[PDB]
Design a protein around this ligand. Structure first.
Ligand code: CL
Length: 203
């Protein structure tokens, strides 16, 4: 037996009004725990605040969209629970107006566009971002973080930020977002849908 332990602790976010922020939380334990997002002890669930569970509910993403300031500025609680305990980690959300952004705040100079790719072919979605410090690029698909390093080589992130799917299958279809992050804050690209098609034929 063992009580819950967090294996992914959520990180603070400084986002931009009208944009998106996501927090990711995951725990382990024996029995395997659940995790649940709350605000001041109350379940988080509303039109703009959505939880997306993963890992048999031992994981949860808290997504806020579109961000509103000042109302969304708060501390949020991820609670992990199993029969042997209940434990909490916190993450802070700050939301800046577009006219209050510091100089180096991340910018999506060119985000990804609608992608159409024939099955089995390579698809590359670009994301060109800038900031000071130079922002780290990550990707989300259907509101969940993409981890290319655990994709068994199916997916990779290019050095210049693009997300590349080596051999496209129907399962790669979905809604992709690029995220640029640095010490100043976080900025999401507009989303881009990816569609897989069949080839042309004579008849
Ligand atoms: Cl439950």
């Amino acid at each position: 037996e063992s009580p819950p332990v967090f294996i992914k602790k959520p990180v603070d976010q400084i986002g931009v009004s009208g944009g998106v922020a996501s927090f990711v939380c995951q725990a382990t334990g024996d029995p395997k725990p659940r995790v649940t997002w709350n605000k001041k002890g109350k379940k988080v669930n509303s039109q703009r605040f959505e939880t997306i569970e993963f890992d048999e509910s031992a994981g949860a993403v808290l997504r806020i969209q579109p961000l509103r300031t000042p109302r969304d500025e708060n501390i949020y609680e991820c609670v992990a629970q199993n029969p042997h305990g209940e434990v909490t980690v916190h993450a802070k959300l700050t939301v800046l107006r577009e006219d209050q952004l510091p100089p180096g705040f991340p910018n999506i100079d060119m985000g990804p566009q609608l992608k159409v790719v024939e099955r089995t072919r390579t698809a590359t979605m670009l994301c060109a971002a800038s900031g000071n410090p130079d922002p780290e690029i990550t990707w989300f698909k259907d509101f969940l973080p993409v981890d290319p390093s655990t994709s068994n080589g199916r997916i990779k992130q290019l050095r210049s930020g693009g997300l590349q799917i080596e051999s496209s299958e129907e399962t790669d279809q979905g809604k992709y977002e690029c995220v640029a992050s640095n010490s100043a804050g976080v900025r999401y690209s507009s989303p881009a849908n990816l569609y897989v098609r069949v080839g042309t034929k004579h008849h």
